[PDB]
């Protein structure tokens, strides 16, 4: 049983697709697939898995199925009555955002306005989640996807594994994306996602760098609790960095909600001094 947006659903509300219509085309590093012809992404549940795993996998399908927003990957259906168990998802030809930023890094193509649109796209999805009282818990560039690598790309939140687990270890917590109260007290609110979006904003304008580059998890933990914060990414415009620093306010009540973040991202797309800033090569 899953609840969201005022309703409770179950494995039944999902759209079961008969296994016979589903064809795998590639591994994607998750597979490209076909449904008779619709092009989809197929998330597979290993047959070698525990019973906790099985329930983990079912919840994710219910979670993503209850969202209706252009910046959240669509759930096409499921194939759970056959093995291995499939979740069918919107295909995002652009791939994940962290790799795209790394491969598309300018070299001897991509401009400041493109990064702001990605940031706006993800901020729009987070607002939708916030307005519906869903806490993602793992906003990060690795969990965002792009429709296409070229112009007119749209970014969307693509993975909800963390929100399903707490619905898995100290060395596995995304500490570098978490605010103090989260890794200290295990408190999670919409203001948890605000902090994480700030780190995501740093990932975006650093063009795919790991946050707190030379630090370890425990170093970051002690750095952040003491009040330390990352420096601007190379060439990052001031107005963009100021969004990050507002997202990283120590007290959650001093952080902006996602409506304000969107508002400030849009004001940055209207500033020539911002969008005419060159990326580092
Ligand atoms: C849920 C989902 C993942 C993807 C995808 C991941 C990596 C590369 C590419 Cl081309 C697509 N699309 N949809």
UniProtKB/Swiss-Prot annotation:
It comes from the Eukaryota. It is found in: Cell membrane. The active site is at residue 138. Phosphorylated at tyrosine residues by autocatalysis, which activates kinase activity. In cells not stimulated by a ligand, receptor protein tyrosine phosphatase beta and zeta complex (PTPRB/PTPRZ1) dephosphorylates ALK at the sites in ALK that are undergoing autophosphorylation through autoactivation. N-glycosylated. ATP binds at residues 43, 90-92, 159. Expressed in brain and CNS. Also expressed in the small intestine and testis, but not in normal lymphoid cells. Residues 22-274 form the Protein kinase domain. The modification Phosphotyrosine is found at residues 2, 31, 167. Changing residue 67 to L: In NBLST3; somatic mutation; constitutively activated; retained in the endoplasmic reticulum and Golgi compartments. Belongs to the protein kinase superfamily. Tyr protein kinase family. Insulin receptor subfamily. Homodimer; homodimerizes following heparin- and ligand-binding. Interacts with CBL, IRS1, PIK3R1 and PLCG1. Interacts with FRS2 and SHC1. Interacts with PTN and MDK. The EGF-like region drives the cytokine specificity for ALKAL2. It is linked to A chromosomal aberration involving ALK is found in a form of non-Hodgkin lymphoma. Translocation t(2;5)(p23;q35) with NPM1. The resulting chimeric NPM1-ALK protein homodimerize and the kinase becomes constitutively activated. The constitutively active fusion proteins are responsible for 5-10% of non-Hodgkin lymphomas. A chromosomal aberration involving ALK is associated with inflammatory myofibroblastic tumors (IMTs). Translocation t(2;11)(p23;p15) with CARS; translocation t(2;4)(p23;q21) with SEC31A. Neuronal receptor tyrosine kinase that is essentially and transiently expressed in specific regions of the central and peripheral nervous systems and plays an important role in the genesis and differentiation of the nervous system. Also acts as a key thinness protein involved in the resistance to weight gain: in hypothalamic neurons, controls energy expenditure acting as a negative regulator of white adipose tissue lipolysis and sympathetic tone to fine-tune energy homeostasis. This is ALK tyrosine kinase receptor. It comes from Homo sapiens (Human). The chain holds residues 1095 to 1399 of 1620 of the full protein.
